[PDB]
JSON list of C-alpha atoms in Angstrom, two decimals:
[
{"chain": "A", "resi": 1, "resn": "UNK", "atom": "CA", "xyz": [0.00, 0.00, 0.00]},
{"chain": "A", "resi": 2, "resn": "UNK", "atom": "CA", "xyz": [1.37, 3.63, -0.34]},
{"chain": "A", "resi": 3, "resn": "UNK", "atom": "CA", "xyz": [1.29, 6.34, 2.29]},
{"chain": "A", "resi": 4, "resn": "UNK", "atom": "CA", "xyz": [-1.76, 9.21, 1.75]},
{"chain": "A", "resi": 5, "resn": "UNK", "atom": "CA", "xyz": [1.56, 11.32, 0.93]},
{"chain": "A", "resi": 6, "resn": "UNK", "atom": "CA", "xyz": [3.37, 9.11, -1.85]},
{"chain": "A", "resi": 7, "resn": "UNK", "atom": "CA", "xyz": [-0.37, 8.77, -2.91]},
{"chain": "A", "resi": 8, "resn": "UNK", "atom": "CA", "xyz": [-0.86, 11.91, -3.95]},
{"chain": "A", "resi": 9, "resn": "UNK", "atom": "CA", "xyz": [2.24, 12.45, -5.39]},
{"chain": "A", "resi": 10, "resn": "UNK", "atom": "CA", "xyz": [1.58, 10.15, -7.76]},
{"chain": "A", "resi": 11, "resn": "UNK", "atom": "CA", "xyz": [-1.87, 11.82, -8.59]},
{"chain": "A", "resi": 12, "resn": "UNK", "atom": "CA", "xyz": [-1.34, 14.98, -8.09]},
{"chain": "A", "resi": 13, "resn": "UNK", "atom": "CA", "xyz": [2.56, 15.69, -9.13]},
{"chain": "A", "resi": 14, "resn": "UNK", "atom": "CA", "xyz": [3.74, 16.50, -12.22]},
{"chain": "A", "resi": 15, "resn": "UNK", "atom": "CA", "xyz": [6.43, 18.79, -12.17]},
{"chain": "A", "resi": 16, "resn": "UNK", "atom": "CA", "xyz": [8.48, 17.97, -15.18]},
{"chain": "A", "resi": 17, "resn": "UNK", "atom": "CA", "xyz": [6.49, 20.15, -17.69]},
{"chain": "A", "resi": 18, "resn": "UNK", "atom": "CA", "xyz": [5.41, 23.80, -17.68]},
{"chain": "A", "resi": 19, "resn": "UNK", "atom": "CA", "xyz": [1.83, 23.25, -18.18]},
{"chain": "A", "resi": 20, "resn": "UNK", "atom": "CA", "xyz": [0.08, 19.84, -20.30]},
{"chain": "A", "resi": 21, "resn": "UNK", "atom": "CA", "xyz": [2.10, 19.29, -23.89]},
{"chain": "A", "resi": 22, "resn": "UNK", "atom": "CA", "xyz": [-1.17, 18.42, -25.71]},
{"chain": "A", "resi": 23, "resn": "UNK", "atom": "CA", "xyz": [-4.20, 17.24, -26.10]},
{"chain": "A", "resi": 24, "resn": "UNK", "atom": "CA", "xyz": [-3.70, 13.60, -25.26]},
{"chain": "A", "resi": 25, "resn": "UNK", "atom": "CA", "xyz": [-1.80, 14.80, -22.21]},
{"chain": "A", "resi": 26, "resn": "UNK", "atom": "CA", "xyz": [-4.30, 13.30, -19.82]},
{"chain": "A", "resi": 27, "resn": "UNK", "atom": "CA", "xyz": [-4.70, 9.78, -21.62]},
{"chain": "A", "resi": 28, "resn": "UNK", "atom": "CA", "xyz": [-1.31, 9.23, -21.35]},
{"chain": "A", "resi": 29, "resn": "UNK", "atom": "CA", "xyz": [-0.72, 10.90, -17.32]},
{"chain": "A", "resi": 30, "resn": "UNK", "atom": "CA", "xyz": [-3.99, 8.75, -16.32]},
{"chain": "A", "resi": 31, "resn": "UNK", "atom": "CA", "xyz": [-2.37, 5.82, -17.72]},
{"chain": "A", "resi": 32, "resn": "UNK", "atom": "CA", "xyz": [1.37, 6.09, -16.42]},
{"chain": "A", "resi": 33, "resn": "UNK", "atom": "CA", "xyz": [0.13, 6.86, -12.84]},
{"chain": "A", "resi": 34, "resn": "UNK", "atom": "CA", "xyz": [-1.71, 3.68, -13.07]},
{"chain": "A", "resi": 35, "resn": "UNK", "atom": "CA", "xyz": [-5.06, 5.84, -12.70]},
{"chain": "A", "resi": 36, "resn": "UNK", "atom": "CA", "xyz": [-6.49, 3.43, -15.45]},
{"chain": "A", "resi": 37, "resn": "UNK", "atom": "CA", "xyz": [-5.86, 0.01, -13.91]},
{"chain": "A", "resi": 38, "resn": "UNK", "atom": "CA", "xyz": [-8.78, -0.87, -11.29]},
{"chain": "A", "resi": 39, "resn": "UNK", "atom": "CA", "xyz": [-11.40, 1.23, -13.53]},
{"chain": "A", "resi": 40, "resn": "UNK", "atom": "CA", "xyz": [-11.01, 4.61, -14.98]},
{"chain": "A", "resi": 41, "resn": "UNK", "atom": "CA", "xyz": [-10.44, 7.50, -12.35]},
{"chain": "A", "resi": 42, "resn": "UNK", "atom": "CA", "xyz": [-13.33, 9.99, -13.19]},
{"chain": "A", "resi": 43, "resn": "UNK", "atom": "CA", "xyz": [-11.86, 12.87, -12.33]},
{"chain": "A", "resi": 44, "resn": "UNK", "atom": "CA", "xyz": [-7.79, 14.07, -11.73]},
{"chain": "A", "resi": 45, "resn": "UNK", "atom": "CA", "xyz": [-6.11, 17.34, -11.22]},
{"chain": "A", "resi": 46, "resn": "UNK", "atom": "CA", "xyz": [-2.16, 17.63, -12.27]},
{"chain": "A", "resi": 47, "resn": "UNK", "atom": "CA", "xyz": [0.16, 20.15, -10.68]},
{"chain": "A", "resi": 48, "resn": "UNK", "atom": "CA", "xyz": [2.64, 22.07, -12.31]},
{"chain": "A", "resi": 49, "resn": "UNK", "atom": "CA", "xyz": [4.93, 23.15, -10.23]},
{"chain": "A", "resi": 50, "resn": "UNK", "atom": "CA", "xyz": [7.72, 22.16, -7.71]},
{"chain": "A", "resi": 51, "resn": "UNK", "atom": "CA", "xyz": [6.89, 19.48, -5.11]},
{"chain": "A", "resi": 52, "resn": "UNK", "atom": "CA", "xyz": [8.31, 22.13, -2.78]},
{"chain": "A", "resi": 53, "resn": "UNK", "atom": "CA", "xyz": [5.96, 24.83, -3.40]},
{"chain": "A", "resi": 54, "resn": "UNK", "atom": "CA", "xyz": [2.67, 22.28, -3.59]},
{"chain": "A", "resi": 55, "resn": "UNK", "atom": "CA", "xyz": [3.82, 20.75, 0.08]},
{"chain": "A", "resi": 56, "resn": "UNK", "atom": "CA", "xyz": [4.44, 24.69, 0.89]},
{"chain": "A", "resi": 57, "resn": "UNK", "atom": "CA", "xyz": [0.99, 24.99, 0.54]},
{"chain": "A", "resi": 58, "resn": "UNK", "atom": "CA", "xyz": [0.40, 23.17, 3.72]},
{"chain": "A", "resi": 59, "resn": "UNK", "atom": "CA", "xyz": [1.65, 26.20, 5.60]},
{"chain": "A", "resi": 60, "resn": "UNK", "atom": "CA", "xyz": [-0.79, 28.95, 3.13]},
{"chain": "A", "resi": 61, "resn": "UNK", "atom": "CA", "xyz": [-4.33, 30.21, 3.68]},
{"chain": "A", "resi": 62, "resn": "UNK", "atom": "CA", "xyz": [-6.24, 27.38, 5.81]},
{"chain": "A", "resi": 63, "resn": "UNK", "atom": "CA", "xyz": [-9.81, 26.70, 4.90]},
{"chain": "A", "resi": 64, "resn": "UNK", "atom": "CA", "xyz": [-12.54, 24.49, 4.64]},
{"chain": "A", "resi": 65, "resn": "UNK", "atom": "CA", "xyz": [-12.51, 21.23, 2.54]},
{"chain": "A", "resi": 66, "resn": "UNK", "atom": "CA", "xyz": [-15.86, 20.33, 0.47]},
{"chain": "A", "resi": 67, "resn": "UNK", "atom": "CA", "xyz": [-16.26, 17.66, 3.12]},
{"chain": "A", "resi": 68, "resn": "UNK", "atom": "CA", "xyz": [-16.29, 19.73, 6.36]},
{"chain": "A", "resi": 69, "resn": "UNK", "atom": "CA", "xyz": [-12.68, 19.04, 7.29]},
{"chain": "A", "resi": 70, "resn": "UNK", "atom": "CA", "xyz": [-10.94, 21.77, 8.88]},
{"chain": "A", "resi": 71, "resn": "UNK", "atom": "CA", "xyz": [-7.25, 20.57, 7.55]},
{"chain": "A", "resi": 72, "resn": "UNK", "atom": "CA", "xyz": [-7.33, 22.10, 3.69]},
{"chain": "A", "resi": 73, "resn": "UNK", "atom": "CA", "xyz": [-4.84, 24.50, 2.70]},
{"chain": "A", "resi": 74, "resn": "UNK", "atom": "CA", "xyz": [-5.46, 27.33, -0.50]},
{"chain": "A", "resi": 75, "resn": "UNK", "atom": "CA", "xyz": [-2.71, 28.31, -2.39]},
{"chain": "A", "resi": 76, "resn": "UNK", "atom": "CA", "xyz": [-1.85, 31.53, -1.72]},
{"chain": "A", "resi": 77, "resn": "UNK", "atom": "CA", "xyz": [-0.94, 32.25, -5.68]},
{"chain": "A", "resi": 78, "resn": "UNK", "atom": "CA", "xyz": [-2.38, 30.33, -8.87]},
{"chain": "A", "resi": 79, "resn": "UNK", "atom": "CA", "xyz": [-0.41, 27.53, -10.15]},
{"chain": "A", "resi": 80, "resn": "UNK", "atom": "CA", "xyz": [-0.41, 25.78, -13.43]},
{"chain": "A", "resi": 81, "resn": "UNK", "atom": "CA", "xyz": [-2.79, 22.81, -13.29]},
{"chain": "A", "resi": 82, "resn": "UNK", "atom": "CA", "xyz": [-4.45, 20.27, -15.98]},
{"chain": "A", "resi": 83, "resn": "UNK", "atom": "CA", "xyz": [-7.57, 19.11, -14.89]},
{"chain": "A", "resi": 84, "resn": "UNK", "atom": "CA", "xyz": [-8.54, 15.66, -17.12]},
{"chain": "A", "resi": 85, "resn": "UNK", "atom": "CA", "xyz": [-11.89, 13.76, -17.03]},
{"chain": "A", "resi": 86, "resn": "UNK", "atom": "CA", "xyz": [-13.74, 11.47, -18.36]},
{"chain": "A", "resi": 87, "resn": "UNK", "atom": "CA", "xyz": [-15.06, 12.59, -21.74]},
{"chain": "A", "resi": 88, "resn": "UNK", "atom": "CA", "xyz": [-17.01, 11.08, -25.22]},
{"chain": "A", "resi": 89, "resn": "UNK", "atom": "CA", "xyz": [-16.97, 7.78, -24.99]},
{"chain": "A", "resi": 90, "resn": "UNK", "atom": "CA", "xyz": [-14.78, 6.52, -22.17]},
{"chain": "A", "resi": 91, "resn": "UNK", "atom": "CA", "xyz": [-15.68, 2.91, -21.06]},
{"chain": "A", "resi": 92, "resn": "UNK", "atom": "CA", "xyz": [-13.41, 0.69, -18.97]},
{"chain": "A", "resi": 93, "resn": "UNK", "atom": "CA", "xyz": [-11.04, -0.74, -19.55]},
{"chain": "A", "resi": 94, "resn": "UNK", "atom": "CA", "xyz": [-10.72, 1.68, -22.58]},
{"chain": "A", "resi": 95, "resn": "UNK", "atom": "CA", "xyz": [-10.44, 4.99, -20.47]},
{"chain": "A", "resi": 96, "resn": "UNK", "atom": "CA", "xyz": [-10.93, 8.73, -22.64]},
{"chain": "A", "resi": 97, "resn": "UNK", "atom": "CA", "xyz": [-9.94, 11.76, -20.81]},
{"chain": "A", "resi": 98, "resn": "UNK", "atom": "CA", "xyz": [-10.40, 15.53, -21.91]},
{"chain": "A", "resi": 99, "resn": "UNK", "atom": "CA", "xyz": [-7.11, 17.75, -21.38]},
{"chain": "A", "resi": 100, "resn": "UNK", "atom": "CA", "xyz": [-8.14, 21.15, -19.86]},
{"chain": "A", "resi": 101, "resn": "UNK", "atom": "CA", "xyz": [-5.06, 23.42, -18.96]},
{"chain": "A", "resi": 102, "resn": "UNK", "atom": "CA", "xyz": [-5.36, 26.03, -16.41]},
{"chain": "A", "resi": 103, "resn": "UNK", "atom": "CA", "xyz": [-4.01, 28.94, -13.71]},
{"chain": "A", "resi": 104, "resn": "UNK", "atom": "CA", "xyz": [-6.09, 28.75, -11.01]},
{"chain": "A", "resi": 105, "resn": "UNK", "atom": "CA", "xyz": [-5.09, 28.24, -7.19]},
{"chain": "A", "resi": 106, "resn": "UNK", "atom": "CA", "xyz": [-5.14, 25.24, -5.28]},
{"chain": "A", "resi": 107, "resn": "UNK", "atom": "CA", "xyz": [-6.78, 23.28, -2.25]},
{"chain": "A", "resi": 108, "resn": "UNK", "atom": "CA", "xyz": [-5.24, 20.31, -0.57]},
{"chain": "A", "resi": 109, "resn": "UNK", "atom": "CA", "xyz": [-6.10, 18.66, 2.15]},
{"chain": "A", "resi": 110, "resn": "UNK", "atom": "CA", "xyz": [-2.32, 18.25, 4.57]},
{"chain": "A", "resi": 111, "resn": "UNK", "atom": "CA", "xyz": [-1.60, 15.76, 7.64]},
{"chain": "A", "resi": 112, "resn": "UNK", "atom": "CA", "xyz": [1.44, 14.00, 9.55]},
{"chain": "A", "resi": 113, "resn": "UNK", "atom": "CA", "xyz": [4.69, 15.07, 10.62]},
{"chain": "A", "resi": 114, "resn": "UNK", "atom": "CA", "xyz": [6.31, 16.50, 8.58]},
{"chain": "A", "resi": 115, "resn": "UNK", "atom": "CA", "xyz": [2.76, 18.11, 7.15]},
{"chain": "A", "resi": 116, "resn": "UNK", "atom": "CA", "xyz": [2.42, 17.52, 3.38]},
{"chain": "A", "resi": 117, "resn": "UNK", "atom": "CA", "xyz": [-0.61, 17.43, 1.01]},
{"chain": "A", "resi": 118, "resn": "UNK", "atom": "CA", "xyz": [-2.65, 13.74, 0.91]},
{"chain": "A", "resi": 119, "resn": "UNK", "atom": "CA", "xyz": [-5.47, 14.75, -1.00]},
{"chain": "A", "resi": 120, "resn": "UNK", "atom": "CA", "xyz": [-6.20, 17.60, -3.51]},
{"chain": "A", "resi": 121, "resn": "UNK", "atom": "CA", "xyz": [-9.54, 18.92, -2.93]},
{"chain": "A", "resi": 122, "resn": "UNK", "atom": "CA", "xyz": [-10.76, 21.49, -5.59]},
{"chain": "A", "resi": 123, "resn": "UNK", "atom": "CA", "xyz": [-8.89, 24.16, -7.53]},
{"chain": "A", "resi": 124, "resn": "UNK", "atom": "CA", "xyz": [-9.99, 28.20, -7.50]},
{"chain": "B", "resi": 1, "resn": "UNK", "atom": "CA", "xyz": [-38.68, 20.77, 0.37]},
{"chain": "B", "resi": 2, "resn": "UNK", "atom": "CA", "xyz": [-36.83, 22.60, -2.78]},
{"chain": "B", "resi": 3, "resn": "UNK", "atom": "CA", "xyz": [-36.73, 21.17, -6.17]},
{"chain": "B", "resi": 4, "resn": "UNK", "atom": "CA", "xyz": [-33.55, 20.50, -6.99]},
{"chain": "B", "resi": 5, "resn": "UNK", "atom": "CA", "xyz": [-33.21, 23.06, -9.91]},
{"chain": "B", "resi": 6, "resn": "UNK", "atom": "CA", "xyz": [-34.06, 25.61, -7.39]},
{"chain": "B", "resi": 7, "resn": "UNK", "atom": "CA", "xyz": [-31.83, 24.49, -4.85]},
{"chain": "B", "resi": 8, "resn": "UNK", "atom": "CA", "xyz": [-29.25, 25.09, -7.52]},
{"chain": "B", "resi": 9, "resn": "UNK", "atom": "CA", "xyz": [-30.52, 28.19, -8.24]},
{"chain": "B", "resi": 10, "resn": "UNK", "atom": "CA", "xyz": [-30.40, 29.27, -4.52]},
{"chain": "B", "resi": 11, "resn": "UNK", "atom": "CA", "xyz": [-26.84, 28.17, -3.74]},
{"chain": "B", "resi": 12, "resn": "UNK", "atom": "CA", "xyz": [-25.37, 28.61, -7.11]},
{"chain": "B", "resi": 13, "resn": "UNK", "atom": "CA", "xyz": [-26.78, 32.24, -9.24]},
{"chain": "B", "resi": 14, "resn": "UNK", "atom": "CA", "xyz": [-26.22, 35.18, -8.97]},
{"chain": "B", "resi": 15, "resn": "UNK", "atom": "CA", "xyz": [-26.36, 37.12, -12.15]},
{"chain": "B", "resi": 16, "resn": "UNK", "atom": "CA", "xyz": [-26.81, 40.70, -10.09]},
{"chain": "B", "resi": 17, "resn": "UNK", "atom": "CA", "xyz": [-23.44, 41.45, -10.47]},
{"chain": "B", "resi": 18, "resn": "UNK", "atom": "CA", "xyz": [-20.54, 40.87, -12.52]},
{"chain": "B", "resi": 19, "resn": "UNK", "atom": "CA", "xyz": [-18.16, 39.62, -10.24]},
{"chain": "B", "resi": 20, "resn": "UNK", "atom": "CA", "xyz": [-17.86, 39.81, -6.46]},
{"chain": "B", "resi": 21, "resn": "UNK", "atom": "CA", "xyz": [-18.17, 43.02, -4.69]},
{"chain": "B", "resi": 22, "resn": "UNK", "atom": "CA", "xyz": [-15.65, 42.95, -2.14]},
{"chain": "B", "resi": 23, "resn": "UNK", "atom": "CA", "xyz": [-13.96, 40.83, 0.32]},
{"chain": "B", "resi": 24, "resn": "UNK", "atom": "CA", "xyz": [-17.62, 40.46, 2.24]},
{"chain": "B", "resi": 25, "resn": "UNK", "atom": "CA", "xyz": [-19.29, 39.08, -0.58]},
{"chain": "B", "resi": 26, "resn": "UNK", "atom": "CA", "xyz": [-19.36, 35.27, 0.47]},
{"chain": "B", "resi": 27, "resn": "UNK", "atom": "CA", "xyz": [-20.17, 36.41, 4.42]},
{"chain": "B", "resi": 28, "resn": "UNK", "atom": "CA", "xyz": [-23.44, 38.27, 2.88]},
{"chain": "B", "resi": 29, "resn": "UNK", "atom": "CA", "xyz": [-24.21, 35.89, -0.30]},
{"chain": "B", "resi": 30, "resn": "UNK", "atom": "CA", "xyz": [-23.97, 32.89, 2.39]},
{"chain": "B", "resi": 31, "resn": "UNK", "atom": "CA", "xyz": [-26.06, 34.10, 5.11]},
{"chain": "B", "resi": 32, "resn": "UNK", "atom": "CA", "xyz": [-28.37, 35.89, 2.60]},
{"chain": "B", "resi": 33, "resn": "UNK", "atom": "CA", "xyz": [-28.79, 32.47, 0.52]},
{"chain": "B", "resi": 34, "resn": "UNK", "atom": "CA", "xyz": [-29.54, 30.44, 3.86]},
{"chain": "B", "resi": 35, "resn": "UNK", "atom": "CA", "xyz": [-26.26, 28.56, 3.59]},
{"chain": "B", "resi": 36, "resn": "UNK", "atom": "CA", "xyz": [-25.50, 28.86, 7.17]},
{"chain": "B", "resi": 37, "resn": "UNK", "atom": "CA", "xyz": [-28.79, 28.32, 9.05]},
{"chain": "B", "resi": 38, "resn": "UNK", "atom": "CA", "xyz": [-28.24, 24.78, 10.29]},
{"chain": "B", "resi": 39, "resn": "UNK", "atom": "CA", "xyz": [-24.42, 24.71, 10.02]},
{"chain": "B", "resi": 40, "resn": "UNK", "atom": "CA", "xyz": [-21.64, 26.87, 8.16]},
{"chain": "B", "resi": 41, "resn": "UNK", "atom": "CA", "xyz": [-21.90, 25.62, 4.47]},
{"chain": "B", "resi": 42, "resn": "UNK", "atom": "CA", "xyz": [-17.93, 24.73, 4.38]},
{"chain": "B", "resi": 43, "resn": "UNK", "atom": "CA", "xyz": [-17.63, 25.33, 0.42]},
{"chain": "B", "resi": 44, "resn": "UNK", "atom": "CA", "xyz": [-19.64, 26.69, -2.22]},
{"chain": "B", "resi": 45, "resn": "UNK", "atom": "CA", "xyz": [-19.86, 28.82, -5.19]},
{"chain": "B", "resi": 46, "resn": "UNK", "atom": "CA", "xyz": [-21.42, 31.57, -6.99]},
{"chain": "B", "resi": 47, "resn": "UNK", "atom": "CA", "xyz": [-21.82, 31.94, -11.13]},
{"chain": "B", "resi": 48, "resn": "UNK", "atom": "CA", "xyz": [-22.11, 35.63, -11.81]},
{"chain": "B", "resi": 49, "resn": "UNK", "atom": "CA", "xyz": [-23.55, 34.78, -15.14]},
{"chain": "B", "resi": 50, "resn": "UNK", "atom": "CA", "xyz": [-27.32, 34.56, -16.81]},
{"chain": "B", "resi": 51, "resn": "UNK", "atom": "CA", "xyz": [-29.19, 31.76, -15.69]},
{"chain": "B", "resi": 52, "resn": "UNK", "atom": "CA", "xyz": [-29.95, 31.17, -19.43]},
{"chain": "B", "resi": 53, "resn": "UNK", "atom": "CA", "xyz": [-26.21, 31.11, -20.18]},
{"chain": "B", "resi": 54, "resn": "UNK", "atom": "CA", "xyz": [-25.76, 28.26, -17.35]},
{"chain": "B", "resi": 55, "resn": "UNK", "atom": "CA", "xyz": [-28.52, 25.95, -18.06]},
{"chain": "B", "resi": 56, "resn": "UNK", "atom": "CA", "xyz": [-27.25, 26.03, -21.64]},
{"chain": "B", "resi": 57, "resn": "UNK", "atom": "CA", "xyz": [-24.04, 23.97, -19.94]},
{"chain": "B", "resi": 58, "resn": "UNK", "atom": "CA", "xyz": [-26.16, 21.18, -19.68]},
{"chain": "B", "resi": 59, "resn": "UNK", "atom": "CA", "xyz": [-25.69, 20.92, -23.82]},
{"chain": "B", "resi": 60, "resn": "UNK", "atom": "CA", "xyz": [-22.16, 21.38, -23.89]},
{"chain": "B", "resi": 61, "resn": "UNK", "atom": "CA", "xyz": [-19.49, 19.10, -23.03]},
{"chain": "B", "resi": 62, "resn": "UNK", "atom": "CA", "xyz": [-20.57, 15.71, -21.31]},
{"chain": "B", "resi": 63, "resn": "UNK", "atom": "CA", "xyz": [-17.78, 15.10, -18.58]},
{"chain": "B", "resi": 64, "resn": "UNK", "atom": "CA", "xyz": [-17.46, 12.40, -15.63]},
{"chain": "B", "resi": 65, "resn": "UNK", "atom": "CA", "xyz": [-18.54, 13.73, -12.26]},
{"chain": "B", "resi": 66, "resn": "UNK", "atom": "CA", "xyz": [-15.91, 13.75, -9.31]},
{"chain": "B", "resi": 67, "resn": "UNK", "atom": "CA", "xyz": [-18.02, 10.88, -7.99]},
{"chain": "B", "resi": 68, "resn": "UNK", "atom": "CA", "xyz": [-18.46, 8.56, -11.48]},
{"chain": "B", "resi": 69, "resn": "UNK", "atom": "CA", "xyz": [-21.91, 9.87, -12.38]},
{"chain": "B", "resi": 70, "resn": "UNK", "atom": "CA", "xyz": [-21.95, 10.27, -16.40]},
{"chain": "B", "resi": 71, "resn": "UNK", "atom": "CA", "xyz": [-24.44, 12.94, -16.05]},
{"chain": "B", "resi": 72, "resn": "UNK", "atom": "CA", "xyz": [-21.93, 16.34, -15.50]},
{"chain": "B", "resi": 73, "resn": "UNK", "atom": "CA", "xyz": [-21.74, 18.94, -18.38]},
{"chain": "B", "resi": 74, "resn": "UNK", "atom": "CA", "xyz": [-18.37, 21.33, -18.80]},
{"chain": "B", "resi": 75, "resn": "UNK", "atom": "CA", "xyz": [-19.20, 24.71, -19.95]},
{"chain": "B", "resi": 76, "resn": "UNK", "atom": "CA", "xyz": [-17.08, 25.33, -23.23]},
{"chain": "B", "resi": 77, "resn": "UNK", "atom": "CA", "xyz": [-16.23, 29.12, -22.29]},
{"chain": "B", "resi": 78, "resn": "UNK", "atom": "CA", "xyz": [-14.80, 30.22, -18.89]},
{"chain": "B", "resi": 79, "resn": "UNK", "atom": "CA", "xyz": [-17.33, 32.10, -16.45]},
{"chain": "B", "resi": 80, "resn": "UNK", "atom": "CA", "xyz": [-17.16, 34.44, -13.93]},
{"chain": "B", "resi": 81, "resn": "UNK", "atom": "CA", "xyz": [-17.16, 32.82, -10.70]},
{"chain": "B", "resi": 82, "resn": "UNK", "atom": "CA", "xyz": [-16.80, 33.31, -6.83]},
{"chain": "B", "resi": 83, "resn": "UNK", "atom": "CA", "xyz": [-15.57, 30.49, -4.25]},
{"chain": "B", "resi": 84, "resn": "UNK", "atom": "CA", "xyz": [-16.88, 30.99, -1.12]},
{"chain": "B", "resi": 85, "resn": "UNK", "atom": "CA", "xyz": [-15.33, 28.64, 1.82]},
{"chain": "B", "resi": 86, "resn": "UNK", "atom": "CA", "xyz": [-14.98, 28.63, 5.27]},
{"chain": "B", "resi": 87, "resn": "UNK", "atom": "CA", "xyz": [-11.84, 30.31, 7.03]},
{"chain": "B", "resi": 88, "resn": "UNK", "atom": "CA", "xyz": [-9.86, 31.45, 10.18]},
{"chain": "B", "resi": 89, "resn": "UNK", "atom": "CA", "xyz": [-12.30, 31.25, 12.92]},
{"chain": "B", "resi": 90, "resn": "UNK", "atom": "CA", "xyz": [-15.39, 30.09, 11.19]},
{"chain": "B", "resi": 91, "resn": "UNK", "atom": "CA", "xyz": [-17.58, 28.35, 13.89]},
{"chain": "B", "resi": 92, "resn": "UNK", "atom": "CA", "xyz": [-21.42, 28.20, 13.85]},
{"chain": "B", "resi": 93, "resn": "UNK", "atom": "CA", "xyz": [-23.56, 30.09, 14.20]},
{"chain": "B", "resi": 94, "resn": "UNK", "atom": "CA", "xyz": [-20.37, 32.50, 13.62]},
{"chain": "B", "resi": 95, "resn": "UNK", "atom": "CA", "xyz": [-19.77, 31.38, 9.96]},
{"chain": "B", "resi": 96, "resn": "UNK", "atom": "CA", "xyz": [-17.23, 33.36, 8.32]},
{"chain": "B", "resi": 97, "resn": "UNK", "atom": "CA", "xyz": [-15.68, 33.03, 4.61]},
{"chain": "B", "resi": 98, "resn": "UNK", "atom": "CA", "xyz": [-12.79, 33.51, 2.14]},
{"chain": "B", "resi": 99, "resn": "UNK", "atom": "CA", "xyz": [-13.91, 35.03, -1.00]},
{"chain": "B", "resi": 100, "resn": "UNK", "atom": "CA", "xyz": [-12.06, 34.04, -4.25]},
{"chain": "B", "resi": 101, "resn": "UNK", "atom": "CA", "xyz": [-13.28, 35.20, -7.71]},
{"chain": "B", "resi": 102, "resn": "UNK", "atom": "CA", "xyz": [-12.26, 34.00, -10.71]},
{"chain": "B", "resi": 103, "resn": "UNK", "atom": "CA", "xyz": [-12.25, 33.26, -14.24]},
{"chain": "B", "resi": 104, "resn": "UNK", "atom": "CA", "xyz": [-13.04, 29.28, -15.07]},
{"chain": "B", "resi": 105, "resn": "UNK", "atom": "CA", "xyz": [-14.92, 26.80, -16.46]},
{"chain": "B", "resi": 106, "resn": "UNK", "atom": "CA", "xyz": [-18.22, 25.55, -14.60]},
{"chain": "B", "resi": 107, "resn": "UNK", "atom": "CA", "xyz": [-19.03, 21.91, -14.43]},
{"chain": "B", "resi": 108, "resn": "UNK", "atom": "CA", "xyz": [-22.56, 21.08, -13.50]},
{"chain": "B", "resi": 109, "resn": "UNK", "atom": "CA", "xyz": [-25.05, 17.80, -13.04]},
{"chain": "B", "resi": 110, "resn": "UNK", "atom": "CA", "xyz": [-27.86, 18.09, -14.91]},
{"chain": "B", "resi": 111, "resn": "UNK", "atom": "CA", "xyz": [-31.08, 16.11, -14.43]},
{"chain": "B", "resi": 112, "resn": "UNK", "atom": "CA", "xyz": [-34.72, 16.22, -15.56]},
{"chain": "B", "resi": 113, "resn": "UNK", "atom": "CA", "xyz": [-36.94, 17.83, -18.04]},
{"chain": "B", "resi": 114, "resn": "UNK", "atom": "CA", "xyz": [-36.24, 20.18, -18.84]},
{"chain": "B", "resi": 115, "resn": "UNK", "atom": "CA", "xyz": [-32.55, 19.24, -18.61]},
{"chain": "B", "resi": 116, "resn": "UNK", "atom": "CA", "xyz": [-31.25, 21.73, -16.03]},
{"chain": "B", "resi": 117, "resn": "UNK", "atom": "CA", "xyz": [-28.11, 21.95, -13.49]},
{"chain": "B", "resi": 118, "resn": "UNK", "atom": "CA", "xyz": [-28.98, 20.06, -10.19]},
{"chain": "B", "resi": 119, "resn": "UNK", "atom": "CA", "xyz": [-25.45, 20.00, -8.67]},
{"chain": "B", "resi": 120, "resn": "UNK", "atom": "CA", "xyz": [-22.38, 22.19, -8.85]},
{"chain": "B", "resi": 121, "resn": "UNK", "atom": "CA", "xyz": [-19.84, 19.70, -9.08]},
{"chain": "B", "resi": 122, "resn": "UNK", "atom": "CA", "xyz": [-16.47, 22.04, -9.68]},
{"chain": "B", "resi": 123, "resn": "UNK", "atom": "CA", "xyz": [-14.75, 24.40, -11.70]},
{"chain": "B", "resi": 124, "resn": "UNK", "atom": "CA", "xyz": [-11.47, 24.46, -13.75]}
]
């Protein structure tokens, strides 16, 4: 099993690109994360930026998560995202996402020691 | 009990104005839309766009919803938008909120006939 951190790293991380290369981005992040494998994740937000400044936003503006929890975090400034979903005709096992690019800041949800993101939560 | 179209309508619209107002937009929109009567609403959002001009999303793009339902709708142009969520020392009945506007996509869940937005599912 992973840790809730390594977790979403692997979701939520992608720091090797500026912002997503095309439109097929998404098909090919929501397969190489292994989002694909159990049954196609609906709905996945990529960050593009440092792993340093997403965990830094552990210790930004905290506010409410959609749930009620009292640990999310708001990016102080917008980052570059790419939201994919489900689009057209996806059907498991063959999985369709739609590429949407975007500046917009983010929400995670942070716990543990040290405190670090384990679940992104909506992006503003 | 609301329909759901107007419980969307009640949380989600509000074409008065073009964008919020100032930083005590969410405290007034919030207590003002009954959001915080039996508990502090912990996240929610405002479309400062014609109602028309939203239940047209539910002819635009067909997306997944964050929870798997097949039934959410991206709107193809951005919109203006305000997040509303709880912050600092929010505690009912002393709700208090963050207000974040912004330029973004809607997505919505759309139900009945006519086909119309039942649940404001995110934005990007």
């Amino acid at each position: 099993k992973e840790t809730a951190a390594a977790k979403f790293e692997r979701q939520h991380m992608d720091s090797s690109t500026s912002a997503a290369s095309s439109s097929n981005y998404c098909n090919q992040m929501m397969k190489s994360r292994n989002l694909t494998k159990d049954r196609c994740k609906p709905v996945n937000t990529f960050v593009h930026e440092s792993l340093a400044d997403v965990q830094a936003v552990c210790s930004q503006k905290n506010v409410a998560c959609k749930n009620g929890q009292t640990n999310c975090y708001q990016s102080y400034s917008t980052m570059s995202i790419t939201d994919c979903r489900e689009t057209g005709s996806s059907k498991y096992p063959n999985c369709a996402y739609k590429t949407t690019q975007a500046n917009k800041h983010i929400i995670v949800a942070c716990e543990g020691n040290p405190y670090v993101p384990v679940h992104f939560d909506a992006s503003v």
